Design an enzyme around this catalytic site. Structure first.
Site, PDB file in Angstrom:
ATOM      1  N   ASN A  46       3.127   7.721   1.114  1.00 57.39           N
ATOM      2  CA  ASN A  46       4.481   8.116   1.456  1.00 57.39           C
ATOM      3  C   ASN A  46       4.903   9.315   0.588  1.00 57.39           C
ATOM      4  O   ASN A  46       4.439   9.467  -0.532  1.00 57.39           O
ATOM      5  CB  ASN A  46       5.407   6.901   1.319  1.00 57.39           C
ATOM      6  CG  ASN A  46       5.081   5.757   2.274  1.00 57.39           C
ATOM      7  OD1 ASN A  46       5.155   4.581   1.920  1.00 57.39           O
ATOM      8  ND2 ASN A  46       4.846   6.082   3.531  1.00 57.39           N
ATOM      9  N   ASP A  52       1.535   2.634   1.651  1.00 55.56           N
ATOM     10  CA  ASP A  52       1.469   1.523   2.586  1.00 55.56           C
ATOM     11  C   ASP A  52       0.046   0.985   2.677  1.00 55.56           C
ATOM     12  O   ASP A  52      -0.912   1.751   2.693  1.00 55.56           O
ATOM     13  CB  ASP A  52       1.915   1.968   3.986  1.00 55.56           C
ATOM     14  CG  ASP A  52       3.337   2.492   4.110  1.00 55.56           C
ATOM     15  OD1 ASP A  52       4.174   2.240   3.213  1.00 55.56           O
ATOM     16  OD2 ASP A  52       3.599   3.124   5.127  1.00 55.56           O
TER      17      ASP A  52
END
Ligand SMILES: [Cl-]
Ligand SMILES: [Cl-]
Ligand code: NA
Ligand code: NA
Lengths: 129, 129
Positions: A46, A52
């Site tokens: 990110n 993630d």
């Protein structure tokens, strides 16, 4: 591990995601598809420095510890690396916490943009469970 | 692998043993229990020189090749060693052939003596599938 569609649906059911908080099975299969393309080893960085992880792309900002997300939380009490396992158990159990957070499955952007309001049953059509 | 009771029931269902040839799931769980005690690595040598293998104790005389059962058949087209895997798939698929042989689940002695006529649902009571 890259899952086949029907194989993932079966495993999600086994772990009790079927109608969890009112979300039918096809919702979960649809999410995984667009988040990870059925790959437990997916990672995506990110802009904010968070990462993630795994089949449902669970974010290090809130949910797991990767030791490199300055000033983050670890709300599922796990290392992020556990969410990359062939065994989906930890991803599933963390997912149950997230969806119980108050915003439901809107916490997954790809679910909100690509799954919500569609005919999600098509994702489990043709599968023995 | 030693399976837990409810874990085995789930996997048997996944592989389509639930009501296969009219045999409810509890029948299969009951058989496995008394044949192998839920252990995929079980082996037992028969007086006739044959060997039974795996969670459902499938006999080398008819069903698999172990290379040391003089004048035997290999009706499931497999090495006997495949039936000792943590993954029950091959045991299951060979089991489906056996039960379709004409004698049904009477081909397992322990099923005939300990499961037949009992309340087999007790074997899957308390399990999420
Ligand atoms: Cl909701
Ligand atoms: Cl029969
Ligand atoms: Na964190
Ligand atoms: Na043989």
């Amino acid at each position: 591990k890259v899952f086949g569609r029907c194989e993932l649906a079966a495993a999600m059911k086994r772990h009790g995601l079927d109608n969890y908080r009112g979300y039918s099975l096809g919702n979960w299969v649809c999410a995984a598809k667009f988040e990870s393309n059925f790959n437990t080893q997916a990672t995506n960085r990110n802009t904010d420095g968070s990462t993630d992880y795994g089949i449902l792309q669970i974010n290090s900002r809130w949910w797991c510890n990767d030791g490199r997300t300055p000033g983050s939380r670890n709300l599922c009490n796990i290392p992020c690396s556990a969410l990359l396992s062939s065994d989906i158990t930890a991803s599933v159990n963390c997912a149950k916490k997230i969806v119980s957070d108050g915003n439901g499955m809107n916490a997954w952007v790809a679910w909100r943009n690509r799954c919500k309001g569609t005919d999600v049953q098509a994702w489990i059509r043709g599968c023995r469970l």
